[PDB]
Amino acid sequence: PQITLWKRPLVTIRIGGQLKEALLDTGADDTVLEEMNLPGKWKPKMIGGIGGFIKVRQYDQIPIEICGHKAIGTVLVGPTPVNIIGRNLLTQIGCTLNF
Amino acid sequence: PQITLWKRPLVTIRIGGQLKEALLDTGADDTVLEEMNLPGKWKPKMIGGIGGFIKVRQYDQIPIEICGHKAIGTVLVGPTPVNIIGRNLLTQIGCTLNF
């Protein structure tokens, strides 16, 4: 598909039994999801942006479905105000910027 | 051009005869540049990111050439970690997400 940028590029993603709306975000190195109690091992991390840093939990090899495309990779979980699909997954679903 | 996402989508911009590197950031509503001098009136504004809110200076109708494409729009100046091109100017240069 082609997604214009008049509005926020929000799309439906699925992670287990949760469907969520998430930004397709070319500015995000990593994928950051709102607080959720995912199973398995994780490692603490701090990530920075406008305003400063937040503390997140890094989960590896988590399958995520983004607009029906399959991805699997690292997901950071913490008190972000918006679900963010970062470049680590955007590349996997074939996402480019075009102008 | 078509820009893939295995690397950060950094591009050269021209603003006030100065060249700068900026990130094409679909997750950003606004264009936000690191501290710099720009001519004219500005308005104080506050914006929010992943780590909270910051104070910026809002400049309107500022020309920027992004990777050869002309925009004229709102540019916020403040303590962003990195120069970012947001949706307000991404739309002006005809940028879309594709997969």
Ligand SMILES: O=C(N[C@@H](Cc1ccccc1)[C@H](O)CN(CC1CCCCC1)S(=O)(=O)c1ccc2ncsc2c1)c1cccc(O)c1
């Ligand atoms: O900060 C914004 N946008 C955010 C997304 C956003 C939207 C709305 C609310 C909060 C955040 C960015 O697109 C992604 N961030 C990465 C940062 C951006 C700042 C400087 C460079 C790198 S980010 O969110 O801070 C971010 C994301 C992934 C990641 N992985 C490793 S470090 C890291 C940082 C934003 C949103 C709306 C208006 C606005 O003026 C700015």
